[PDB]
Ligand binder design. Structure first.
Ligand SMILES: [K+]
Ligand SMILES: [K+]
Ligand SMILES: [K+]
Ligand SMILES: [K+]
Ligand SMILES: [K+]
Ligand SMILES: [K+]
Ligand SMILES: [K+]
Ligand SMILES: [K+]
Ligand SMILES: [Mg+2]
Ligand SMILES: [Mg+2]
Ligand SMILES: [Mg+2]
Ligand SMILES: [Mg+2]
Ligand SMILES: [Mg+2]
Ligand SMILES: [Mg+2]
Ligand SMILES: [Mg+2]
Ligand SMILES: [Mg+2]
Ligand SMILES: [Mg+2]
Ligand SMILES: [Mg+2]
Ligand SMILES: [Mg+2]
Ligand SMILES: [Mg+2]
Ligand SMILES: [Mg+2]
Ligand SMILES: [Mg+2]
Ligand SMILES: [Mg+2]
Ligand SMILES: [Mg+2]
Ligand SMILES: [Mg+2]
Ligand SMILES: [Mg+2]
Ligand SMILES: [Mg+2]
Ligand SMILES: [Mg+2]
Ligand SMILES: [Mg+2]
Ligand SMILES: [Mg+2]
Ligand SMILES: [Mg+2]
Ligand SMILES: [Mg+2]
Ligand SMILES: [Mg+2]
Ligand SMILES: [Mg+2]
Ligand SMILES: [Mg+2]
Ligand SMILES: [Mg+2]
Ligand SMILES: [Mg+2]
Ligand SMILES: [Mg+2]
Ligand SMILES: [Mg+2]
Ligand SMILES: [Mg+2]
Ligand SMILES: [Mg+2]
Ligand SMILES: [Mg+2]
Ligand SMILES: [Mg+2]
Ligand SMILES: [Mg+2]
Ligand SMILES: [Mg+2]
Ligand SMILES: [Mg+2]
Ligand SMILES: [Mg+2]
Ligand SMILES: [Mg+2]
Lengths: 44, 158, 136, 71, 110, 130
RNA sequence: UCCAUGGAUCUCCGAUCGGGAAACCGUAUCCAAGCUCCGUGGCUAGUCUGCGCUCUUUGGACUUUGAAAACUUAGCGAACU
RNA sequence: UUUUUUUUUUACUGUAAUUGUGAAAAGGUUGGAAGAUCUGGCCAAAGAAGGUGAUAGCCCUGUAGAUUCGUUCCUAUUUUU
RNA sequence: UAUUCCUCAAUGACCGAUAGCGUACAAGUACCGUGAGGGAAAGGUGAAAAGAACCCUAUGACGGGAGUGCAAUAGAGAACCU
RNA sequence: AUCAGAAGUGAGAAUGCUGACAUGAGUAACGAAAAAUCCUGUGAAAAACAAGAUCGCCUGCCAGUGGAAGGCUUUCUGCGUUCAGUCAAUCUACGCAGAGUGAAUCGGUCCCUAAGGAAACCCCGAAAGGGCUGCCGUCCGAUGGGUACACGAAAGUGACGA
């Protein structure tokens, strides 16, 4: 059947991309927490 | 299984070409000359001593058989021979009249004589070529001075 | 002289002298050489060319001394400019006091945290390289 | 030469692995300007000029001789 | 053969025979004796040699063969680096500001 | 000085690595590898100023470097640019130059596994691409 | 090789010249001064002067502060229990 | 203007000399190998520690110090508007 | 007086590979999730590679001999002490 | 040793935790009512590989052509069979190595805007922020409009349903 994940690159960059995170205070907190944990992938 | 936390020897009192005596191991009590020093392992190779047997399978390039070669000895297992008494001795540091570091025999029962730096060290392992290659500039062309700052000879095209 | 090849320029001057065109080396061409040599900051060779010009029979007027005094004052050397003023006074040239502006080049005049981190990084590498290498 | 990278660097967007309207570029120097009809006018003032001298008759070679010279 | 017959053959080692020997890189003190014109000519000689060497390494490794004398490439590379250092030294010692800036621009331009 | 132009290069450093062609005679085009920040005009002007080629046209394409991955460990080579250079006149490569004989022998080792009319051309141009 | 000091070179994002799907795209800022070279115009024509750009130097005009754990001082302020 | 140089004297977490210098003997036995054991000398302001073919103060690297080097002060950075 | 993003030196009737940090080993990785986020496993040949030339039987030596080594079930290719 | 001291101090059970290994069991299964057969070759081994012949299945939504979205080297050539493939595979979307993608016109970039998003100014709000896109107004944003200068506009337009 049709499943939940239907990939689209531009929607991924517009929802979870670097500048999408930089545009909100919560996204900037996500980036800071993300760098503090040491993840190699800061943004999706 | 190199399991020890062994630090490197930073300043070696044991040099290539030195006359030494093995003071520890299977070949204890035997003299020889230091062919090679393996600094990364704190080990040396004494010519003709500490022999192993290698089972080398002959490929298209090298030859097979069981070969006898030297295995490395730890640098603390050999000792420089006192040039006067002929016995193994420790090495001390003496500063000369000009101020140059030399090695002297050290220890009770030693002459204190200067242990000379081996003459083999000044010889190049890769000798210089006899004939220059087709892309090698001869030295007389290298030395041709075409630039002079005082008279402005060889300035750019400004 | 524009390419700062002053020795070759002097040799070409002498070669022009040898060819019989020495009369066309009047004061205008020598002043042009002095202007070029002062414009590319070769004041010592400019003084050499000035001395050769004085030995060639060309008579420098007020423009040559104006150029040389201005270049000497711009390089913050008032004594040499006054010396050329006295020389031009001796030669009998209509010279005057003047304000020459000095170039603004010759006028006289705890470890941070990233540095500590870099020092610790270097020391950590140095510790790892102080041991006997495992052969492989 | 092979060199180690992080596996996370494969997630950086590249136009080879993107929708067809994603443009990145390779830091090439521009040679002109875009037009508003979708074209491009190359301006020769922005083009490189290479000043290369003639190499015939030159005596200096890539390497310096290693033959034994003098003490 | 002896000489490259076309510009394509300048990407090949025509002098390779008897093991061929290659000298060392240029030293900075030896390059400080050379004029700007000689240094630019030597730069392009080194550039053509470097192009030939990388071409030979690329051709041989495409057929799973070893590239002989691989130390030839860093010799040329270091000689080119020393040439640019010597020319920048001459640019810094220039007393004229305009000439110094033009010499720096000539060295570093791409 | 800067009277001559805006972008004047006295010490070019563009790397050109020639790819070995399939044929040794009647070479109307050849391929080379270079860095991905090179443009068609840079390749053309370097090849005609430094080497004296008679360049008709330059085509370019970008390639990713070869990568090997084993789950966390990734090793890679650099991305490069491949350039096709079409010549105004055909050229040729001598047989005895190193390493042409070895390359041809290896290539032939990997590939092991009269009725002409009037006004028929014999050596025509063979150019690929668009 | 290596060490100490001082130098030359010194890609990009984060990021701050503008745009942006981070690691890309577009960018000779603007305006006074004084100097070699460059080009063109005009006099009664000789060390004759008057107009310019490009790039160089010194300034001054716009604006770019900027990160960082805990501690500190403040604002707002739960619920389980 | 520049160079040579009179230049006091001690103190320092200066965790300075990355990794400078830095003491101290020989035999027998067993054992693959000696540091073990038996005989028997010596250093210690050094018996912290890590190695070396087993458990080594004297085999090696160190270690305590001692020397060098560089901050202080004696040796005022003053004078002119 | 408070605190430790940090540096240098030192200590432990602290732990010793299911313990000790999530990580003694290229770990905030692999892997899972659209995302915020969650989150591993895996140490030890031998003193030294001397890592087993050569023979025999199998398609193929990891086998059986031989040889190295104090010792070879101490014979391994992110793994061989017991 | 002994005598004392410090405790993360004693396992058989918590549908306890981690790892290892059994049982069921050589059992179920080997995944769409298209389908196989033989000669020759290769190899240690061939129903499953190569090449050929015979036979069948798909032909307007499982089955052909080109490609968007996604994937990202799976493409091709040589070598190979440790892993994978519902195999004992010599073969392969598998391992090693090398190679391959050529544009003025194709698709993008670029110009233009929609829905929408955001700055500036202004309004509002314990903080964080929220609103406002205009009467003079900026920058983004295709799923649409454009294809051989630049500047300007009280000219026309572009310009549209079933
Ligand atoms: K309550
Ligand atoms: K010391
Ligand atoms: K020893
Ligand atoms: K010891
Ligand atoms: K764990
Ligand atoms: K054992
Ligand atoms: K249980
Ligand atoms: K198709
Ligand atoms: Mg993800
Ligand atoms: Mg060891
Ligand atoms: Mg890197
Ligand atoms: Mg692609
Ligand atoms: Mg760029
Ligand atoms: Mg550069
Ligand atoms: Mg293209
Ligand atoms: Mg920016
Ligand atoms: Mg020391
Ligand atoms: Mg000592
Ligand atoms: Mg010890
Ligand atoms: Mg033991
Ligand atoms: Mg375990
Ligand atoms: Mg255990
Ligand atoms: Mg653990
Ligand atoms: Mg074997
Ligand atoms: Mg053991
Ligand atoms: Mg308990
Ligand atoms: Mg228990
Ligand atoms: Mg159960
Ligand atoms: Mg049953
Ligand atoms: Mg049944
Ligand atoms: Mg069944
Ligand atoms: Mg058959
Ligand atoms: Mg078949
Ligand atoms: Mg449908
Ligand atoms: Mg693959
Ligand atoms: Mg395939
Ligand atoms: Mg293949
Ligand atoms: Mg098989
Ligand atoms: Mg299988
Ligand atoms: Mg494959
Ligand atoms: Mg188009
Ligand atoms: Mg709108
Ligand atoms: Mg809005
Ligand atoms: Mg707002
Ligand atoms: Mg914006
Ligand atoms: Mg727009
Ligand atoms: Mg569109
Ligand atoms: Mg319409």
């Amino acid at each position: 059947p049709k499943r939940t994940f239907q990939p689209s690159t531009i929607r991924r960059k517009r929802n979870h991309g670097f500048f999408a995170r930089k545009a909100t205070k919560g996204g900037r907190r996500v980036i800071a927490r993300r760098i503090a944990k040491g993840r190699h992938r800061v943004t999706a | 299984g190199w399991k020890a936390a062994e630090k490197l020897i930073r300043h070696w009192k044991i040099l290539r070409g030195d006359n030494v005596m093995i003071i520890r191991g299977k070949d204890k009590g035997e003299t020889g000359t230091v062919k090679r020093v393996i600094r990364s392992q704190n080990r040396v190779i004494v010519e003709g001593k500490n022999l192993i047997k290698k089972h080398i399978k002959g490929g298209p390039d090298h030859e097979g058989g069981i070969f006898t070669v030297e295995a490395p000895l730890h640098a603390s297992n050999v000792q420089v021979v006192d040039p006067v008494t002929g016995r193994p001795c420790k090495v001390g540091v003496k500063y000369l009249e000009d101020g140059t570091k030399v090695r002297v025999a050290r220890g009770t029962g030693t002459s204190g004589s200067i242990i000379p730096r081996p003459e083999i060290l000044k010889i190049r392992t890769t000798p210089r070529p006899t004939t220059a290659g087709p892309k090698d500039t001869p030295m007389e062309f290298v030395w041709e001075q075409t630039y002079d700052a005082k008279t402005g000879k060889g300035m750019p095209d400004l | 002289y524009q390419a700062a090849r002053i020795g070759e320029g002097d040799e070409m001057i002498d070669k022009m002298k040898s060819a019989g065109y020495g009369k066309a080396l009047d004061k205008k061409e020598y002043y042009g050489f002095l202007k070029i040599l002062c414009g590319i900051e070769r004041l010592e060779h400019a003084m050499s060319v000035f001395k050769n010009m004085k030995a060639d029979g060309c008579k420098p007027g007020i423009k040559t001394y104006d150029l040389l005094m201005g270049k000497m004052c711009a390089n913050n050397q008032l004594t040499r400019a006054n010396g050329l003023y006295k020389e031009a006074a001796r030669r009998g040239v209509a010279v005057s006091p003047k304000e020459y502006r000095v170039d603004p080049r010759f006028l006289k005049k705890r470890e941070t945290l990233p540095e500590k981190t870099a020092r610790k990084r270097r020391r950590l590498k140095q510790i790892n390289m102080s041991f006997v290498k495992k052969p492989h | 030469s092979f060199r180690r990278k992080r596996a996370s660097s494969l997630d950086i967007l590249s136009p080879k692995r993107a929708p067809r309207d994603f443009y990145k570029g390779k830091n090439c120097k521009p040679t002109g300007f875009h037009t508003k009809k979708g074209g491009y006018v190359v301006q020769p003032d922005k083009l490189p000029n290479y000043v290369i001298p003639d190499l015939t008759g030159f005596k200096l070679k890539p390497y310096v001789s290693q033959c034994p010279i003098e003490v | 053969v002896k000489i490259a017959k076309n510009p394509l053959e300048e990407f090949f080692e025509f002098d390779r025979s008897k093991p061929v020997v290659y000298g060392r890189g240029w030293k900075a003190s030896e390059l400080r004796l050379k004029s700007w014109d000689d240094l630019q000519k030597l730069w392009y000689v080194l550039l053509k040699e470097k192009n030939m060497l990388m071409t030979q390494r690329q051709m041989l490794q495409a057929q799973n063969m070893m590239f002989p004398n691989p130390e030839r490439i860093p010799k040329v590379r270091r000689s080119m680096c020393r040439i640019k250092h010597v020319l920048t030294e001459r640019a810094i010692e220039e007393p004229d500001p305009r000439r110094s800036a033009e010499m720096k621009r000539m060295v570093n331009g791409m | 000085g800067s009277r001559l132009g805006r972008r004047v290069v006295h010490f070019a450093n563009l790397p050109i690595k020639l790819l070995m062609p399939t044929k040794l005679t009647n070479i109307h085009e050849f391929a080379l590898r270079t860095i991905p920040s090179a443009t068609k005009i840079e390749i053309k002007r370097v090849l005609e100023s430094l080497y004296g080629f008679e360049v008709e046209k330059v085509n370019t394409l970008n390639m990713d470097g070869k990568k090997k991955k084993r789950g966390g460990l990734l090793i890679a080579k650099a991305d490069y640019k491949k350039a096709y250079v079409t010549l105004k006149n055909p050229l040729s490569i001598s047989g005895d130059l190193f390493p042409v004989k070895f390359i041809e022998e290896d290539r032939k080792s990997k590939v092991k596994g009269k009725k002409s009319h009037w006004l028929d051309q014999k050596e025509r141009r063979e150019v690929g691409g668009y």
